[PDB]
Amino acid sequence: HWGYGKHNGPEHWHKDFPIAKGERQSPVDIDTHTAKYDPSLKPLSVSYDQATSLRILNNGHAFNVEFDDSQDKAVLKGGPLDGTYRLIQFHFHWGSLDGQGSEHTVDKKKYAAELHLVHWNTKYGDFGKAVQQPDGLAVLGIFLKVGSAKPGLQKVVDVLDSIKTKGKSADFTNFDPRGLLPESLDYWTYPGSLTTPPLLECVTWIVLKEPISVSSEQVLKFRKLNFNGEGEPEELMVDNWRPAQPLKNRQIKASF
Ligand SMILES: CCN[C@H]1C[C@H](C)S(=O)(=O)c2sc(S(N)(=O)=O)cc21
Ligand SMILES: [Zn+2]
């Protein structure tokens, strides 16, 4: 089934998911000299003070930190969005080496990793309904570069040893996602898709301009995770990123 290796990787996904060759696929390269500054674009409103994290899980493709989304606790509003989008989970994509790992690129520059905070439009009532709609999800993407340690990331790094292999999960309460935000919330936005199967074209992408920095030893611990389940041959979970897709009939807008 799908993965990131030679035999089941991104170049093969269209055989099982024909929308892989669709008109609003993600990620894309953001060319900064062609993005249009749009003065109509409102500031983002990130209200994460009431976030309740529950669990961290290795799902064989990345690891997800899951949030309670039964009520409007942690939400995203404003920017290009109409309505309220609830945070349900975040995960990362990263590389085997510091010069690759992000899915979006900026003037073809690749970063060491990319954080995706996934939110769904509450007017559709549940998550499963929201992914079937063109404005169902909003994903906030943040680039990670290697430099100084990010204090707010260390609790995540410390629990990775307990979810080394696919299917493992651990309780992960009281984690505050505000510790993962850059100082500035300036952004680019465009209409796109999920970057993994099922590749549904339901996402409004909001990619922040400012990277956060993490240390070398923090990103090193991501690279020790396993794609495989326990008792199977070890394959290190690295390079779980999709390459940039054609922009086609789309415009990237900048808030700045
Ligand atoms: C491993 C499958 N992950 C898929 C399906 C999940 C149900 S989701 O939350 O819709 C989601 S969000 C993204 S991404 N990389 O575009 O942010 C990929 C996925
Ligand atoms: Zn992602």
Side-chain angles (χ1 to χ4, degrees):
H1 222 274
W2 74 269
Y4 292 96
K6 176 145 54 286
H7 291 112
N8 64 354
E11 60 291 333
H12 293 271
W13 294 350
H14 70 98
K15 285 176 286 175
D16 283 308
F17 300 92
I19 200 167
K21 297 198 182 302
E23 300 300 283
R24 53 174 278 192
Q25 285 295 291
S26 292
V28 296
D29 177 55
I30 297 159
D31 173 337
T32 64
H33 300 107
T34 276
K36 241 290 260 215
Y37 165 64
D38 180 358
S40 320
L41 234 36
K42 298 175 201 71
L44 284 178
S45 175
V46 181
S47 311
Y48 287 171
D49 61 302
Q50 248 63 246
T52 302
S53 63
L54 297 165
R55 197 175 69 152
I56 186 161
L57 162 81
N58 176 337
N59 63 16
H61 297 294
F63 58 90
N64 294 177
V65 171
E66 296 162 353
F67 287 83
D68 178 15
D69 66 339
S70 61
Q71 284 194 79
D72 284 350
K73 288 183 165 82
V75 302
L76 178 66
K77 290 164 185 154
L81 306 172
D82 298 320
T84 303
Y85 288 70
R86 291 184 185 151
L87 176 66
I88 176 167
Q89 56 112 324
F90 70 74
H91 60 271
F92 298 85
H93 294 264
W94 59 93
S96 45
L97 296 167
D98 297 349
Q100 59 191 47
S102 65
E103 299 207 291
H104 294 86
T105 56
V106 182
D107 294 330
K108 305 282 226 287
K109 187 199 197 318
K110 291 180 174 80
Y111 285 87
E114 194 172 319
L115 170 60
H116 290 164
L117 293 125
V118 182
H119 313 72
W120 60 274
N121 191 337
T122 59
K123 73 156 164 159
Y124 297 120
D126 63 71
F127 182 82
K129 299 301 179 301
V131 299
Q132 304 170 186
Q133 300 288 171
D135 60 350
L137 301 195
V139 183
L140 192 60
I142 296 175
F143 295 123
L144 274 67
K145 59 137 105 302
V146 178
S148 313
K150 186 72 170 172
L153 186 64
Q154 194 58 35
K155 276 175 52 177
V156 177
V157 167
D158 290 330
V159 77
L160 294 183
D161 275 330
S162 68
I163 57 155
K164 192 192 181 63
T165 55
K166 178 189 192 74
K168 296 290 192 186
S169 61
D171 297 319
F172 198 62
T173 52
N174 306 106
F175 176 79
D176 185 344
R178 290 178 295 180
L180 299 177
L181 297 179
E183 173 182 315
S184 181
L185 297 188
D186 286 338
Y187 64 85
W188 297 279
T189 186
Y190 73 100
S193 73
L194 301 181
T195 65
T196 67
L199 300 161
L200 297 172
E201 294 180 334
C202 65
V203 185
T204 297
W205 275 98
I206 297 161
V207 179
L208 300 187
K209 178 179 60 181
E210 182 187 328
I212 52 160
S213 74
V214 295
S215 68
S216 189
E217 15 297 300
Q218 284 183 318
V219 72
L220 267 156
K221 292 197 197 180
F222 288 9
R223 297 179 182 142
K224 293 172 82 159
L225 256 18
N226 287 180
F227 282 127
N228 58 284
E230 193 189 333
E232 293 182 345
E234 186 177 38
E235 250 311 277
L236 295 173
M237 184 181 280
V238 289
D239 292 316
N240 52 353
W241 52 273
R242 186 184 194 199
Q245 298 305 309
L247 190 62
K248 284 172 171 177
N249 185 257
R250 293 176 288 176
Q251 184 165 85
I252 296 177
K253 297 175 158 296
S255 73
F256 61 92

